[PDB]
Ligand binder design. Structure first.
Ligand SMILES: COc1cc(Cc2ccnc(N3CCNCC3)c2)nc(N2CCNCC2)n1
Lengths: 39, 156
């Protein structure tokens, strides 16, 4: 049996670590929910 | 059991040690997680039991105790925050500007942040702390790295 454990509050934090680019991709979603990169 | 609003860890005692299979969000008495984490199975919270209410494999979402409550969405312009809860590590807010998943059915948001697969189900926050989607389902790009979508369900 799986179980849950609290790990924090849902809050926006000022002065947070900023990382990560903004890519625009062409993808396809299947009946199984798996995203595949379309080219 | 405990139904306090916030972010939770989805754990299993089925393997060696206590492995963290995913993450979820409690809001208005509903546990919101990605389907691929729990596989639609019932969870436990203290002595209490969380039984599923709604789920969809294509959307990769599942809600417990009640219908999906999260209804906010990315504005396509503003920076967001992934409140990442990684396995064996403390919750961490990571600010980023989202990308785009251009599909035949519509454009969806995206986050190019790579975390261990046990982080699946971590919320994505707007400037008010409103949950606009969940991290953990996306695609692998030519870089080898992962780009997850901002997955959000419908409120009725
Ligand atoms: C390369 O793919 C993945 C997938 C996932 C999550 C996952 C795993 C298994 N099956 C899934 N599904 C949901 C949709 N279709 C049905 C099956 C989903 N996680 C990561 N990660 C690798 C490290 N970085 C982030 C997590 N990669």
């Amino acid at each position: 049996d799986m179980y849950i454990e609290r790990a924090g509050d849902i809050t926006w934090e000022k002065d947070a670590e900023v990382t990560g680019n903004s890519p625009r991709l062409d993808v396809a979603l299947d009946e199984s929910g798996d995203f595949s990169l379309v080219e | 059991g405990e139904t306090t609003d916030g972010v939770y860890r989805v754990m299993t005692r089925r393997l060696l040690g206590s492995t963290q299979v995913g993450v979820g969000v409690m809001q208005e008495g509903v546990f919101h997680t990605m389907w691929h984490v729990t596989k639609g199975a019932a969870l436990r919270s203290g002595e209490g039991r969380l039984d599923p209410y709604w789920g969809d494999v294509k959307q990769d979402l599942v809600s417990y105790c009640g219908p999906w409550k999260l209804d906010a969405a990315w504005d396509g312009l503003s920076e967001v925050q992934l409140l990442a809860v990684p396995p064996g590590e403390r919750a961490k807010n990571i600010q980023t500007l989202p990308g785009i998943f251009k599909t035949k059915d519509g454009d969806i948001g995206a986050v190019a942040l790579d975390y261990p697969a046990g982080t699946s189900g971590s919320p994505i926050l707007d400037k008010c702390g409103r949950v606009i989607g969940l991290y953990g389902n996306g695609v692998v790009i030519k870089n080898g790295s992962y780009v997850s979508a901002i997955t959000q369900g419908k409120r009725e």
